[PDB]
Amino acid sequence: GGDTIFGKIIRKEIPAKIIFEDDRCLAFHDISPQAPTHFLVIPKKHISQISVAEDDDESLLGHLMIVGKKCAADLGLNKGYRMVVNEGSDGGQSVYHVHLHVLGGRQMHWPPG
Amino acid sequence: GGDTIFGKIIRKEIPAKIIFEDDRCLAFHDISPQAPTHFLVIPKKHISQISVAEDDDESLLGHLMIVGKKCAADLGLNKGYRMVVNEGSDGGQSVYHVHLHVLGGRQMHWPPG
Ligand SMILES: Nc1ncnc2c1ncn2[C@@H]1O[C@H](COP(=O)(O)CP(=O)(O)O)[C@@H](O)[C@H]1O
């Protein structure tokens, strides 16, 4: 689902510590975590960045989060966590396939970067 | 609606520089801005934290995101931005009512807190 490394991972072309999968997304642990628990929830539809998402991707986008809070519960993150979507340069996006970051396992700080 | 500060704002007790509103959500500038452009998007129905959210609130959550991107774009955050949702303790939540954070203007750093 796309011409980025997230696509290769979705296509099972390369490995990722896969956490959850359904027909429209895939959750896996970040290869370079910034917290004890750091995983990603990505959709299989190739949306490059959130600013490019359609009104018609609303449920899908909400699914990513739904999936996000579920998988967090199942990783023993009962004390809280932070969810992050980055858009472009200023935002710090590393891969141009939209995705949700879920980080837990320590105190997250303010500001959020 | 709500008991919280955000319930007070949904019910116009205290004003807010409203960027957007609809039947489902409300977007307003943050009074403790962490970047040049820093705004919040809360749903009008009371969900206090993301872990108590049902699969039913999926499109409403995708909607906060869709509106988030709309507003960032309407407030001209063309270089990028970052959306952050805070969960419980570890997440740094004090305001117990679901809310999407949108930050822009400056370069956002990694890790996100
Ligand atoms: N009257 C208000 N108008 C706009 N934003 C507000 C108001 N009161 C509180 N907020 C904002 O609520 C946001 C914080 O919510 P949380 O992320 O859940 C908790 P914390 O600030 O402890 O990290 C802050 O950015 C703060 O400025």
Side-chain angles (χ1 to χ4, degrees):
Chain A
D3 42 14
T4 72
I5 200 163
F6 282 7
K8 301 180 110 302
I9 280 172
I10 293 169
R11 288 200 300 289
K12 308 294 148 80
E13 285 178 22
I14 65 146
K17 303 165 288 290
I18 294 160
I19 302 186
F20 170 88
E21 197 176 350
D22 61 23
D23 71 331
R24 56 206 68 195
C25 64
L26 202 202
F28 50 101
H29 293 286
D30 204 294
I31 185 149
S32 185
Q34 297 311 309
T37 314
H38 186 186
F39 67 88
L40 306 189
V41 192
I42 72 171
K44 284 172 184 185
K45 176 195 186 162
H46 186 224
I47 309 182
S48 72
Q49 43 222 110
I50 200 90
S51 63
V52 142
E54 321 110 44
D55 247 308
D56 308 5
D57 283 320
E58 166 227 60
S59 61
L60 182 59
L61 287 184
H63 189 52
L64 299 180
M65 298 181 95
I66 286 319
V67 167
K69 64 95 189 60
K70 206 158 299 274
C71 283
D74 294 355
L75 292 174
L77 284 187
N78 81 307
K79 276 256 70 171
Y81 55 93
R82 178 169 290 158
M83 283 175 167
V84 179
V85 189
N86 297 332
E87 159 61 36
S89 79
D90 262 7
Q93 226 194 300
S94 334
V95 182
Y96 279 76
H97 181 116
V98 68
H99 48 283
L100 187 69
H101 288 269
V102 181
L103 317 101
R106 47 147 184 122
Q107 278 289 170
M108 297 311 307
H109 307 107
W110 211 238
Chain B
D3 202 306
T4 99
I5 320 172
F6 299 21
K8 260 176 184 183
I9 289 292
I10 287 159
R11 289 186 289 95
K12 301 105 50 192
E13 192 115 19
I14 339 160
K17 206 172 166 192
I18 302 316
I19 300 164
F20 174 93
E21 91 251 275
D22 80 359
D23 70 317
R24 296 195 265 176
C25 72
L26 170 55
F28 58 108
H29 292 298
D30 200 281
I31 64 169
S32 288
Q34 301 305 312
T37 315
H38 171 192
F39 72 87
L40 292 152
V41 192
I42 50 170
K44 292 188 176 184
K45 71 172 281 205
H46 200 180
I47 311 173
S48 54
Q49 55 248 9
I50 222 65
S51 31
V52 306
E54 319 151 86
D55 306 359
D56 280 327
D57 310 324
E58 169 180 314
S59 277
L60 176 72
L61 276 172
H63 183 60
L64 301 179
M65 292 203 146
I66 283 296
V67 170
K69 86 139 199 171
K70 289 290 180 213
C71 296
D74 281 4
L75 293 175
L77 306 179
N78 50 87
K79 266 284 227 54
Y81 55 80
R82 175 181 291 169
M83 305 175 159
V84 189
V85 186
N86 279 337
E87 177 58 72
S89 330
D90 284 9
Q93 190 181 7
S94 44
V95 188
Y96 283 112
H97 181 114
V98 180
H99 62 253
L100 181 64
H101 280 287
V102 184
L103 297 94
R106 57 177 187 81
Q107 171 66 71
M108 299 305 289
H109 302 141
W110 210 242

Short mmCIF file of all heavy atoms in Angstrom, two decimals, chain A residues 17-82:
data_model
loop_
_atom_site.label_atom_id
_atom_site.label_comp_id
_atom_site.label_asym_id
_atom_site.label_seq_id
_atom_site.Cartn_x
_atom_site.Cartn_y
_atom_site.Cartn_z
N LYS A 17 7.91 -5.85 14.09
CA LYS A 17 7.28 -6.54 15.21
C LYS A 17 5.76 -6.17 15.14
O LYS A 17 5.28 -5.19 15.72
CB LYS A 17 7.92 -6.11 16.56
CG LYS A 17 9.41 -6.34 16.63
CD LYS A 17 9.98 -5.57 17.80
CE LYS A 17 9.99 -4.03 17.55
NZ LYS A 17 10.99 -3.53 16.50
N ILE A 18 5.02 -6.97 14.38
CA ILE A 18 3.61 -6.77 14.21
C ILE A 18 2.81 -7.00 15.46
O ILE A 18 2.82 -8.09 16.02
CB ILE A 18 3.10 -7.65 13.13
CG1 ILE A 18 3.72 -7.19 11.82
CG2 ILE A 18 1.56 -7.58 13.10
CD1 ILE A 18 3.72 -8.22 10.68
N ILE A 19 2.09 -5.96 15.88
CA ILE A 19 1.23 -6.03 17.05
C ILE A 19 -0.24 -6.40 16.74
O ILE A 19 -0.85 -7.25 17.39
CB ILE A 19 1.21 -4.71 17.78
CG1 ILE A 19 2.62 -4.33 18.19
CG2 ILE A 19 0.37 -4.83 19.03
CD1 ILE A 19 2.65 -3.13 19.03
N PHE A 20 -0.85 -5.68 15.82
CA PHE A 20 -2.21 -5.97 15.46
C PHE A 20 -2.38 -5.73 14.00
O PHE A 20 -1.55 -5.08 13.36
CB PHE A 20 -3.17 -5.14 16.25
CG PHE A 20 -4.55 -5.23 15.75
CD1 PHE A 20 -5.40 -6.23 16.21
CD2 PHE A 20 -5.02 -4.32 14.81
CE1 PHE A 20 -6.71 -6.32 15.75
CE2 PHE A 20 -6.33 -4.40 14.33
CZ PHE A 20 -7.18 -5.40 14.81
N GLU A 21 -3.35 -6.45 13.44
CA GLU A 21 -3.67 -6.32 12.04
C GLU A 21 -5.14 -6.65 11.86
O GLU A 21 -5.70 -7.39 12.69
CB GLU A 21 -2.83 -7.24 11.15
CG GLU A 21 -2.86 -6.82 9.64
CD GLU A 21 -1.98 -7.62 8.71
OE1 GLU A 21 -1.17 -8.40 9.22
OE2 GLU A 21 -2.11 -7.48 7.46
N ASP A 22 -5.79 -5.92 10.94
CA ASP A 22 -7.17 -6.21 10.53
C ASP A 22 -7.18 -5.96 9.03
O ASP A 22 -6.11 -5.90 8.41
CB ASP A 22 -8.28 -5.51 11.31
CG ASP A 22 -8.24 -3.92 11.23
OD1 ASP A 22 -7.68 -3.31 10.30
OD2 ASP A 22 -8.85 -3.30 12.11
N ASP A 23 -8.34 -5.85 8.41
CA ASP A 23 -8.39 -5.61 6.96
C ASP A 23 -8.03 -4.17 6.44
O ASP A 23 -7.76 -3.99 5.26
CB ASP A 23 -9.80 -5.97 6.51
CG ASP A 23 -10.83 -4.95 6.99
OD1 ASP A 23 -10.64 -4.30 8.05
OD2 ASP A 23 -11.82 -4.80 6.27
N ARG A 24 -8.04 -3.18 7.32
CA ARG A 24 -7.76 -1.83 6.91
C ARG A 24 -6.56 -1.14 7.58
O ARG A 24 -6.31 0.04 7.29
CB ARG A 24 -9.01 -0.97 7.12
CG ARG A 24 -9.51 -1.01 8.53
CD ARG A 24 -11.00 -0.73 8.59
NE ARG A 24 -11.74 -1.82 8.00
CZ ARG A 24 -13.02 -1.77 7.63
NH1 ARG A 24 -13.72 -0.66 7.79
NH2 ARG A 24 -13.56 -2.82 7.03
N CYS A 25 -5.85 -1.84 8.48
CA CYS A 25 -4.67 -1.26 9.18
C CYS A 25 -3.72 -2.31 9.67
O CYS A 25 -4.00 -3.52 9.59
CB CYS A 25 -5.08 -0.36 10.38
SG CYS A 25 -5.95 -1.06 11.86
N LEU A 26 -2.64 -1.81 10.28
CA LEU A 26 -1.59 -2.63 10.89
C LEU A 26 -0.87 -1.83 12.02
O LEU A 26 -0.44 -0.67 11.86
CB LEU A 26 -0.54 -3.07 9.83
CG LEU A 26 0.41 -4.30 10.00
CD1 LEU A 26 1.60 -4.05 9.07
CD2 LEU A 26 0.91 -4.52 11.39
N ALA A 27 -0.79 -2.44 13.19
CA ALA A 27 -0.10 -1.80 14.28
C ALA A 27 1.21 -2.63 14.45
O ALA A 27 1.20 -3.87 14.30
CB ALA A 27 -0.94 -1.84 15.52
N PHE A 28 2.33 -1.92 14.65
CA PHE A 28 3.63 -2.57 14.87
C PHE A 28 4.48 -1.64 15.73
O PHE A 28 4.17 -0.43 15.83
CB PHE A 28 4.34 -2.95 13.54
CG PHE A 28 4.42 -1.82 12.54
CD1 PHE A 28 5.61 -1.10 12.38
CD2 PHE A 28 3.32 -1.50 11.73
CE1 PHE A 28 5.71 -0.08 11.42
CE2 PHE A 28 3.42 -0.49 10.75
CZ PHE A 28 4.60 0.23 10.59
N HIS A 29 5.48 -2.21 16.42
CA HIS A 29 6.37 -1.42 17.31
C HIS A 29 7.33 -0.61 16.51
O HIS A 29 7.78 -1.04 15.46
CB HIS A 29 7.19 -2.29 18.24
CG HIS A 29 6.37 -3.00 19.27
ND1 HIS A 29 5.83 -2.37 20.37
CD2 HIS A 29 6.07 -4.32 19.40
CE1 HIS A 29 5.25 -3.26 21.14
NE2 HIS A 29 5.37 -4.45 20.57
N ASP A 30 7.61 0.59 16.97
CA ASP A 30 8.55 1.43 16.23
C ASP A 30 9.98 0.86 16.34
O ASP A 30 10.45 0.52 17.44
CB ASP A 30 8.49 2.88 16.75
CG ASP A 30 8.95 3.88 15.73
OD1 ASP A 30 10.14 3.84 15.38
OD2 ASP A 30 8.12 4.70 15.26
N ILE A 31 10.64 0.75 15.19
CA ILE A 31 11.99 0.29 15.09
C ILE A 31 13.00 1.16 15.87
O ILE A 31 14.10 0.72 16.15
CB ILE A 31 12.45 0.15 13.62
CG1 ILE A 31 13.86 -0.45 13.63
CG2 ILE A 31 12.53 1.54 12.90
CD1 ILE A 31 14.23 -1.32 12.44
N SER A 32 12.60 2.38 16.25
CA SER A 32 13.41 3.32 17.01
C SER A 32 12.49 4.01 18.01
O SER A 32 12.08 5.17 17.83
CB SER A 32 14.03 4.34 16.06
OG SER A 32 14.93 5.22 16.73
N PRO A 33 12.19 3.32 19.11
CA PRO A 33 11.30 3.85 20.15
C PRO A 33 11.81 5.05 20.99
O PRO A 33 12.96 5.08 21.41
CB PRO A 33 11.03 2.62 21.00
CG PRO A 33 12.36 1.88 20.92
CD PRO A 33 12.78 2.02 19.50
N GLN A 34 10.88 5.94 21.35
CA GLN A 34 11.18 7.15 22.12
C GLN A 34 10.53 7.07 23.49
O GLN A 34 10.34 8.06 24.20
CB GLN A 34 10.65 8.35 21.35
CG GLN A 34 11.36 8.53 19.98
CD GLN A 34 12.90 8.47 20.09
OE1 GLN A 34 13.49 9.16 20.91
NE2 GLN A 34 13.52 7.59 19.32
N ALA A 35 10.08 5.87 23.80
CA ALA A 35 9.43 5.55 25.04
C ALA A 35 9.51 4.02 25.09
O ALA A 35 9.76 3.37 24.07
CB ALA A 35 7.97 6.04 25.03
N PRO A 36 9.40 3.44 26.29
CA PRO A 36 9.43 2.00 26.65
C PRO A 36 8.46 1.25 25.75
O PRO A 36 8.74 0.16 25.26
CB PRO A 36 8.98 2.04 28.11
CG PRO A 36 9.72 3.33 28.62
CD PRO A 36 9.40 4.30 27.50
N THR A 37 7.31 1.89 25.56
CA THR A 37 6.33 1.39 24.63
C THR A 37 6.16 2.47 23.53
O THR A 37 5.75 3.60 23.79
CB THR A 37 4.98 1.15 25.32
OG1 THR A 37 5.21 0.46 26.54
CG2 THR A 37 4.05 0.30 24.42
N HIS A 38 6.43 2.09 22.30
CA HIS A 38 6.28 2.99 21.20
C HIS A 38 5.91 2.16 19.99
O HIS A 38 6.72 1.38 19.42
CB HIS A 38 7.57 3.82 20.97
CG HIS A 38 7.42 4.86 19.91
ND1 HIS A 38 8.47 5.63 19.47
CD2 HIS A 38 6.34 5.23 19.18
CE1 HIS A 38 8.04 6.43 18.50
NE2 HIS A 38 6.75 6.20 18.31
N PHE A 39 4.66 2.31 19.59
CA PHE A 39 4.18 1.59 18.40
C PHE A 39 3.45 2.47 17.39
O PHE A 39 2.99 3.56 17.71
CB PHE A 39 3.31 0.37 18.81
CG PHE A 39 2.01 0.72 19.46
CD1 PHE A 39 0.86 0.95 18.66
CD2 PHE A 39 1.92 0.81 20.85
CE1 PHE A 39 -0.38 1.27 19.26
CE2 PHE A 39 0.68 1.13 21.47
CZ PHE A 39 -0.48 1.36 20.67
N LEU A 40 3.26 1.95 16.21
CA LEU A 40 2.61 2.71 15.19
C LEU A 40 1.27 2.06 14.74
O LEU A 40 1.12 0.84 14.78
CB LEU A 40 3.52 2.77 13.95
CG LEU A 40 4.96 3.25 14.10
CD1 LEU A 40 5.55 3.42 12.76
CD2 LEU A 40 4.98 4.62 14.80
N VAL A 41 0.30 2.88 14.36
CA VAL A 41 -0.93 2.34 13.78
C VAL A 41 -1.06 3.01 12.43
O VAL A 41 -1.18 4.24 12.34
CB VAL A 41 -2.21 2.58 14.60
CG1 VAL A 41 -3.37 1.71 14.02
CG2 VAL A 41 -1.99 2.25 16.05
N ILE A 42 -0.96 2.23 11.37
CA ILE A 42 -1.05 2.77 10.06
C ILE A 42 -2.20 2.13 9.26
O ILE A 42 -2.68 1.04 9.54
CB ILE A 42 0.28 2.55 9.25
CG1 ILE A 42 0.43 1.09 8.88
CG2 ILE A 42 1.51 2.86 10.14
CD1 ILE A 42 1.56 0.85 7.94
N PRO A 43 -2.68 2.85 8.28
CA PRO A 43 -3.76 2.30 7.47
C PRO A 43 -3.11 1.71 6.26
O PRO A 43 -1.94 1.97 5.98
CB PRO A 43 -4.60 3.52 7.12
CG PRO A 43 -3.53 4.62 7.03
CD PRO A 43 -2.63 4.32 8.22
N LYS A 44 -3.82 0.76 5.64
CA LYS A 44 -3.34 0.12 4.45
C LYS A 44 -3.63 0.98 3.24
O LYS A 44 -3.01 0.77 2.21
CB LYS A 44 -3.94 -1.28 4.27
CG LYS A 44 -3.31 -2.32 5.20
CD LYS A 44 -4.02 -3.66 5.17
CE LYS A 44 -3.38 -4.62 6.20
NZ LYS A 44 -3.94 -5.99 6.14
N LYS A 45 -4.62 1.89 3.31
CA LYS A 45 -4.87 2.79 2.15
C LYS A 45 -3.72 3.83 2.15
O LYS A 45 -3.40 4.45 3.17
CB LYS A 45 -6.23 3.50 2.25
CG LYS A 45 -6.56 4.53 1.13
CD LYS A 45 -7.75 5.44 1.50
CE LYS A 45 -8.16 6.36 0.34
NZ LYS A 45 -9.52 6.91 0.54
N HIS A 46 -3.09 3.99 1.00
CA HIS A 46 -1.98 4.89 0.94
C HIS A 46 -2.37 6.37 1.00
O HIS A 46 -2.76 6.95 0.01
CB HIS A 46 -1.05 4.54 -0.26
CG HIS A 46 0.23 5.35 -0.33
ND1 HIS A 46 0.72 5.88 -1.51
CD2 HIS A 46 1.11 5.74 0.63
CE1 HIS A 46 1.83 6.56 -1.27
NE2 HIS A 46 2.09 6.49 0.02
N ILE A 47 -2.46 6.89 2.23
CA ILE A 47 -2.64 8.33 2.45
C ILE A 47 -1.20 8.82 2.85
O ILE A 47 -0.60 8.32 3.78
CB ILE A 47 -3.69 8.66 3.54
CG1 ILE A 47 -4.97 7.88 3.23
CG2 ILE A 47 -4.01 10.20 3.56
CD1 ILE A 47 -6.11 8.13 4.18
N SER A 48 -0.61 9.69 2.05
CA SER A 48 0.75 10.15 2.30
C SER A 48 0.99 11.01 3.55
O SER A 48 2.02 10.88 4.21
CB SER A 48 1.33 10.81 1.02
OG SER A 48 0.76 12.07 0.72
N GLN A 49 0.06 11.92 3.84
CA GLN A 49 0.11 12.82 5.00
C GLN A 49 -1.35 13.18 5.30
O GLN A 49 -2.16 13.20 4.36
CB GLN A 49 0.90 14.10 4.67
CG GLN A 49 0.60 14.70 3.32
CD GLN A 49 1.86 15.20 2.58
OE1 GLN A 49 2.28 14.61 1.57
NE2 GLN A 49 2.44 16.30 3.05
N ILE A 50 -1.66 13.42 6.58
CA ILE A 50 -2.98 13.74 7.09
C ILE A 50 -3.68 14.93 6.40
O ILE A 50 -4.92 14.99 6.32
CB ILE A 50 -2.91 14.05 8.61
CG1 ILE A 50 -4.30 13.92 9.27
CG2 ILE A 50 -2.33 15.49 8.88
CD1 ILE A 50 -4.55 12.53 9.79
N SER A 51 -2.89 15.89 5.95
CA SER A 51 -3.42 17.09 5.34
C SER A 51 -3.98 16.75 3.98
O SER A 51 -4.72 17.51 3.39
CB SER A 51 -2.32 18.18 5.25
OG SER A 51 -1.25 17.75 4.39
N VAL A 52 -3.67 15.55 3.51
CA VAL A 52 -4.11 15.11 2.19
C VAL A 52 -5.36 14.14 2.26
O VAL A 52 -6.01 13.83 1.23
CB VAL A 52 -2.84 14.58 1.38
CG1 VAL A 52 -3.13 13.38 0.53
CG2 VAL A 52 -2.20 15.74 0.53
N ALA A 53 -5.73 13.79 3.50
CA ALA A 53 -6.86 12.91 3.82
C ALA A 53 -8.17 13.58 3.43
O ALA A 53 -8.34 14.80 3.56
CB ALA A 53 -6.87 12.56 5.31
N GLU A 54 -9.13 12.75 3.00
CA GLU A 54 -10.43 13.21 2.55
C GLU A 54 -11.41 13.04 3.69
O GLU A 54 -11.13 12.26 4.62
CB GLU A 54 -10.89 12.37 1.35
CG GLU A 54 -9.81 11.98 0.31
CD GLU A 54 -9.46 10.47 0.32
OE1 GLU A 54 -10.41 9.64 0.38
OE2 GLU A 54 -8.25 10.10 0.29
N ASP A 55 -12.56 13.75 3.59
CA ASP A 55 -13.67 13.72 4.60
C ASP A 55 -14.20 12.30 4.71
O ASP A 55 -14.71 11.86 5.75
CB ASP A 55 -14.84 14.65 4.17
CG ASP A 55 -15.02 15.88 5.09
OD1 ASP A 55 -15.13 15.73 6.35
OD2 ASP A 55 -15.11 17.01 4.54
N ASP A 56 -13.95 11.59 3.61
CA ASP A 56 -14.31 10.23 3.39
C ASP A 56 -13.29 9.25 4.00
O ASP A 56 -13.38 8.07 3.77
CB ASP A 56 -14.48 10.01 1.86
CG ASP A 56 -15.45 11.06 1.19
OD1 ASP A 56 -15.92 12.02 1.86
OD2 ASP A 56 -15.74 10.93 -0.04
N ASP A 57 -12.31 9.75 4.75
CA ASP A 57 -11.32 8.89 5.42
C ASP A 57 -11.53 9.04 6.95
O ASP A 57 -10.77 8.46 7.78
CB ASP A 57 -9.90 9.29 5.07
CG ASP A 57 -9.47 8.82 3.68
OD1 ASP A 57 -9.79 7.70 3.27
OD2 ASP A 57 -8.72 9.55 3.01
N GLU A 58 -12.58 9.81 7.29
CA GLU A 58 -12.93 10.07 8.67
C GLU A 58 -13.08 8.82 9.57
O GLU A 58 -12.50 8.78 10.70
CB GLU A 58 -14.18 10.93 8.72
CG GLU A 58 -14.85 11.01 10.07
CD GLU A 58 -16.35 10.80 9.97
OE1 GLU A 58 -16.76 9.72 9.51
OE2 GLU A 58 -17.11 11.72 10.33
N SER A 59 -13.78 7.78 9.09
CA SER A 59 -13.99 6.59 9.94
C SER A 59 -12.73 5.78 10.04
O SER A 59 -12.43 5.25 11.12
CB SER A 59 -15.17 5.70 9.50
OG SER A 59 -15.00 5.19 8.19
N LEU A 60 -12.00 5.74 8.94
CA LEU A 60 -10.74 5.07 8.85
C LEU A 60 -9.72 5.70 9.84
O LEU A 60 -9.00 4.98 10.60
CB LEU A 60 -10.21 5.20 7.43
CG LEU A 60 -8.87 4.41 7.35
CD1 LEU A 60 -9.04 2.91 7.70
CD2 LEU A 60 -8.23 4.58 5.98
N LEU A 61 -9.71 7.04 9.84
CA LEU A 61 -8.83 7.80 10.70
C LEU A 61 -9.23 7.57 12.13
O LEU A 61 -8.35 7.52 13.02
CB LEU A 61 -8.84 9.31 10.33
CG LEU A 61 -8.16 9.88 9.04
CD1 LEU A 61 -8.29 11.40 9.07
CD2 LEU A 61 -6.63 9.52 8.85
N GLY A 62 -10.54 7.53 12.37
CA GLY A 62 -11.03 7.24 13.71
C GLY A 62 -10.71 5.77 14.12
O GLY A 62 -10.49 5.43 15.30
N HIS A 63 -10.70 4.87 13.14
CA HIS A 63 -10.39 3.46 13.38
C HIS A 63 -8.97 3.36 13.93
O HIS A 63 -8.77 2.76 14.99
CB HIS A 63 -10.55 2.62 12.12
CG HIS A 63 -10.45 1.14 12.36
ND1 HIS A 63 -11.21 0.50 13.32
CD2 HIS A 63 -9.66 0.19 11.81
CE1 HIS A 63 -10.88 -0.79 13.35
NE2 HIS A 63 -9.95 -1.00 12.44
N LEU A 64 -8.00 3.96 13.22
CA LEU A 64 -6.60 4.03 13.64
C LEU A 64 -6.41 4.36 15.14
O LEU A 64 -5.56 3.79 15.83
CB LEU A 64 -5.87 5.09 12.82
CG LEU A 64 -5.77 4.95 11.31
CD1 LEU A 64 -5.01 6.13 10.77
CD2 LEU A 64 -5.01 3.71 11.03
N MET A 65 -7.26 5.24 15.65
CA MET A 65 -7.23 5.63 17.02
C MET A 65 -7.89 4.62 17.87
O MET A 65 -7.46 4.37 18.99
CB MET A 65 -7.95 6.93 17.24
CG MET A 65 -7.32 8.05 16.50
SD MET A 65 -8.23 9.52 16.84
CE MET A 65 -7.22 10.10 18.13
N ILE A 66 -8.99 4.08 17.37
CA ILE A 66 -9.70 3.11 18.13
C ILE A 66 -8.72 1.98 18.36
O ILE A 66 -8.56 1.51 19.50
CB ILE A 66 -10.99 2.62 17.36
CG1 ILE A 66 -12.07 3.72 17.40
CG2 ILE A 66 -11.47 1.27 17.93
CD1 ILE A 66 -12.18 4.43 18.78
N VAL A 67 -8.13 1.52 17.27
CA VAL A 67 -7.13 0.46 17.30
C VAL A 67 -6.00 0.88 18.21
O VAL A 67 -5.54 0.08 19.02
CB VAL A 67 -6.58 0.12 15.90
CG1 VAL A 67 -5.33 -0.74 16.07
CG2 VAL A 67 -7.71 -0.63 15.06
N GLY A 68 -5.68 2.18 18.18
CA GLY A 68 -4.63 2.71 19.03
C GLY A 68 -4.84 2.56 20.52
O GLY A 68 -3.89 2.24 21.24
N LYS A 69 -6.04 2.81 21.01
CA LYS A 69 -6.25 2.72 22.44
C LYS A 69 -6.36 1.27 22.95
O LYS A 69 -5.96 0.97 24.08
CB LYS A 69 -7.42 3.63 22.88
CG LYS A 69 -8.76 3.27 22.33
CD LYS A 69 -9.56 2.39 23.30
CE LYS A 69 -10.85 1.83 22.67
NZ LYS A 69 -10.60 0.97 21.46
N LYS A 70 -6.75 0.38 22.04
CA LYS A 70 -6.94 -1.05 22.27
C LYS A 70 -5.59 -1.75 22.45
O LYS A 70 -5.35 -2.51 23.40
CB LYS A 70 -7.65 -1.66 21.06
CG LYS A 70 -8.47 -2.91 21.34
CD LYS A 70 -9.56 -3.15 20.25
CE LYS A 70 -10.63 -1.99 20.14
NZ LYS A 70 -11.84 -2.05 21.07
N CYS A 71 -4.74 -1.55 21.45
CA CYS A 71 -3.45 -2.12 21.47
C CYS A 71 -2.69 -1.56 22.67
O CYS A 71 -1.87 -2.24 23.22
CB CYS A 71 -2.71 -1.82 20.18
SG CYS A 71 -3.13 -2.75 18.76
N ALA A 72 -2.95 -0.32 23.08
CA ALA A 72 -2.23 0.27 24.21
C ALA A 72 -2.62 -0.45 25.47
O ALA A 72 -1.84 -0.54 26.41
CB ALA A 72 -2.56 1.81 24.39
N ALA A 73 -3.90 -0.77 25.57
CA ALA A 73 -4.39 -1.48 26.75
C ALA A 73 -3.73 -2.83 26.86
O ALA A 73 -3.31 -3.21 27.92
CB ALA A 73 -5.90 -1.63 26.72
N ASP A 74 -3.62 -3.52 25.74
CA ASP A 74 -2.98 -4.82 25.65
C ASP A 74 -1.46 -4.93 25.78
O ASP A 74 -0.88 -6.02 25.55
CB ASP A 74 -3.35 -5.45 24.33
CG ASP A 74 -4.80 -5.77 24.24
OD1 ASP A 74 -5.52 -5.60 25.26
OD2 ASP A 74 -5.19 -6.20 23.12
N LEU A 75 -0.82 -3.79 26.02
CA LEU A 75 0.64 -3.65 26.18
C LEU A 75 0.90 -3.14 27.62
O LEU A 75 1.93 -2.51 27.89
CB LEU A 75 1.21 -2.63 25.14
CG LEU A 75 1.19 -3.04 23.65
CD1 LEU A 75 1.64 -1.93 22.68
CD2 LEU A 75 2.04 -4.31 23.44
N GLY A 76 -0.10 -3.32 28.50
CA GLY A 76 -0.01 -2.92 29.89
C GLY A 76 0.17 -1.43 30.13
O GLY A 76 0.72 -1.06 31.16
N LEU A 77 -0.25 -0.57 29.21
CA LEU A 77 -0.10 0.86 29.40
C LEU A 77 -1.34 1.41 30.05
O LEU A 77 -2.16 2.06 29.44
CB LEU A 77 0.20 1.58 28.10
CG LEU A 77 1.62 1.50 27.50
CD1 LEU A 77 1.73 2.45 26.28
CD2 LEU A 77 2.69 1.89 28.54
N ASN A 78 -1.44 1.15 31.34
CA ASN A 78 -2.55 1.58 32.16
C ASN A 78 -2.33 2.97 32.78
O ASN A 78 -3.26 3.56 33.31
CB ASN A 78 -2.73 0.58 33.32
CG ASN A 78 -1.73 0.83 34.50
OD1 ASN A 78 -0.51 0.92 34.29
ND2 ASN A 78 -2.28 1.01 35.72
N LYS A 79 -1.10 3.46 32.82
CA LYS A 79 -0.90 4.75 33.45
C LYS A 79 -1.03 5.98 32.54
O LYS A 79 -0.87 7.10 33.02
CB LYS A 79 0.44 4.77 34.19
CG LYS A 79 0.40 4.17 35.58
CD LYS A 79 0.42 5.26 36.66
CE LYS A 79 -0.90 6.05 36.70
NZ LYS A 79 -1.02 6.98 37.88
N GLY A 80 -1.33 5.78 31.26
CA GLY A 80 -1.44 6.89 30.34
C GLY A 80 -0.49 6.73 29.17
O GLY A 80 0.33 5.82 29.13
N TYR A 81 -0.63 7.60 28.18
CA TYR A 81 0.18 7.55 26.98
C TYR A 81 -0.11 8.73 26.05
O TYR A 81 -1.02 9.53 26.28
CB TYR A 81 0.01 6.19 26.27
CG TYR A 81 -1.43 5.83 25.93
CD1 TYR A 81 -1.97 6.16 24.67
CD2 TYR A 81 -2.24 5.18 26.85
CE1 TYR A 81 -3.28 5.85 24.35
CE2 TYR A 81 -3.56 4.86 26.53
CZ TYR A 81 -4.07 5.20 25.28
OH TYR A 81 -5.36 4.89 24.95
N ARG A 82 0.70 8.89 25.02
CA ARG A 82 0.47 9.99 24.16
C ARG A 82 0.34 9.49 22.77
O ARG A 82 1.00 8.52 22.43
CB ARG A 82 1.63 10.98 24.27
CG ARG A 82 1.47 12.17 23.35
CD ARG A 82 2.45 13.26 23.65
NE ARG A 82 2.08 13.84 24.92
CZ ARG A 82 2.89 14.53 25.71
NH1 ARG A 82 4.17 14.74 25.38
NH2 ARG A 82 2.40 15.01 26.84
#
